[PDB]
Write a protein that binds this ligand. Structure first.
Ligand SMILES: CN1C(=O)[C@@H](NC(=O)c2nnc(Cc3ccccc3)[nH]2)COc2ccc(C#CC3CCOCC3)cc21
Ligand SMILES: CN1C(=O)[C@@H](NC(=O)c2nnc(Cc3ccccc3)[nH]2)COc2ccc(C#CC3CCOCC3)cc21
Lengths: 257, 266
């Protein structure tokens, strides 16, 4: 998974498009600094993320590790992120939204099956290709411990609000997924009427959630019930992603596909 | 301070400054290895020269065994640099994370030396404003010196140019640091010295971490693995109190810690 700057013919911070000599078009995020000693650790972390190989999970394709040049290289994603897609003038039909949801469940079930907690799932981290299929990404480097060399709380489980030393769990991601479901059908971010972030945090910790009545589109009653289950205050009362899939897939095929 | 010339230096190699931009290990043609930080590279600005020189001379009146000194400045047509001693072991975080562990007796002495350097700086009316492990440099005998690598105390040279920040400065860009701000930074440095790592590894978002610390979250005391004396745990909680007025002074910290250090850790 080691790449060289010379492997490239041509060209959340500063990124660029990269034309690889033999492996196609890519996206590069680069850190320019005085050199490391360290590099072996960054590489073991990159080979770990590169082991995450699933159709609904962004592929880290390589890294550049050169004296003073440290770069992550991931696959190209044509259509931006889910919020960009949801705000687009051409509205996204119910069948496509339902398939988007199913693909998010598939990617998250893969990640959890691999022992990986995302910890920052949100629409900005759900990237979309040309046919509206999605891939889950970690553009904030919340899982790239070493490489992380360098509005945001609406999807965060309340057990992490004002509690930064508590350890995230799979149920942390299930809460984020609940609010993503709301955004998918509201076509916007939640809590547009909140007073200030400090008050909002305390409100969410005490049980406030996105306003379901601000969903104006038709939203199947199953998805409404699913989002409320996945954002229960008690983490234990939220389902697992395999549990969600096993109910949601029959519903998707029977009713949405 | 010596008025050095770029020609005094034979060659140089880039180093990791630990978050403070590009610096290099330079070899002085008669004085050997030093650390150079080029601050200005542009057109002629002779008007500032006497001031930059005086600022460097003023800062070099901070003379204490635990406080970094400038070795020289380079003041030339369009090029301006600072030059300081090469602390072979890097900063405190680099030392804490090395393979060879650091014995408790040395950690106690490092803490004592940080207290001495800060008490000196505060006695001279200097507020550091950016005290953190990356600003604590370590020589080969594991003695430390406090540095100002961010230039927060270099007015003219900075013009010509969150983990450790007290909660009363978080989300406050009109923040006016005080001595008690530095004491808070010291408390987190104390935790880091015994945790051998940076605090808050489970924080996900900056606004999460900022609002959490403002509401009273602190480095995870239970997350210290190696033995940390109960006195020092008590010391850090005292120094990272929410009320700045409740925090002790550095002479006050010293009066507690030095007797403890000599009887237990030395
Ligand atoms: C180049 N680059 C990357 O390699 C990023 N890597 C991942 O995210 C990632 N790699 N493996 C997974 C799977 C995964 C594993 C575990 C949990 C979750 C997911 N994720 C990190 O650094 C970036 C930040 C930002 C942009 C960008 C950009 C813009 C252009 C493209 O559209 C979006 C905006 C690109 C990158
Ligand atoms: C060369 N150089 C300096 O002269 C720096 N000078 C001070 O900091 C300093 N000078 N007088 C005091 C006293 C003082 C005053 C007020 C409060 C506290 C102290 N302070 C500023 O510009 C730098 C930035 C960064 C690096 C570096 C580096 C790394 C290289 C590898 O090893 C680790 C360090 C080096 C420098």
């Amino acid at each position: 998974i080691k790449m060289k700057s010379s492997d490239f013919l041509e060209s959340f911070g500063k990124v660029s498009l990269a034309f690889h000599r033999t492996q196609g078009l890519m996206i590069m995020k680069t850190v320019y600094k005085g050199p490391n000693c360290h590099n072996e650790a960054l590489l073991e972390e990159a080979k770990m993320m590169n082991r995450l190989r699933h159709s609904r999970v962004v592929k880290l394709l390589g890294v550049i590790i050169e004296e003073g040049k440290y770069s992550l290289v991931m696959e190209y994603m044509e259509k931006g992120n889910l919020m960009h897609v949801l705000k687009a003038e051409m509205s996204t039909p119910l069948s496509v939204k339902g398939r988007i949801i199913l693909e998010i469940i598939e990617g998250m079930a893969y990640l959890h099956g691999k022992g990986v907690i995302h910890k920052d799932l949100k629409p900005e981290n759900i990237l979309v290709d040309n046919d509206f299929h999605i891939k889950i990404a970690d553009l904030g480097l919340a899982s790239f411990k070493m490489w992380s060399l360098n509005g945001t709380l609406y999807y965060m489980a309340p057990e992490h609000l004002n509690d930064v030393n508590a350890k995230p769990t799979e149920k942390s991601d299930v809460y984020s997924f609940a609010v993503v479901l709301w955004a998918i059908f509201a076509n916007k971010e939640p809590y547009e009427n909140a007073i200030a972030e400090q008050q909002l945090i305390m409100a969410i910790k005490s049980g406030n959630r996105p306003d379901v009545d601000d969903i104006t589109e038709y939203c199947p009653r199953e998805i409404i019930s699913l989002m409320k289950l996945c954002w229960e205050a008690n983490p234990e009362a939220r389902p697992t992603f395999p549990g969600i899939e096993e109910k949601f897939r029959p519903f998707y095929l029977s009713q949405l596909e």
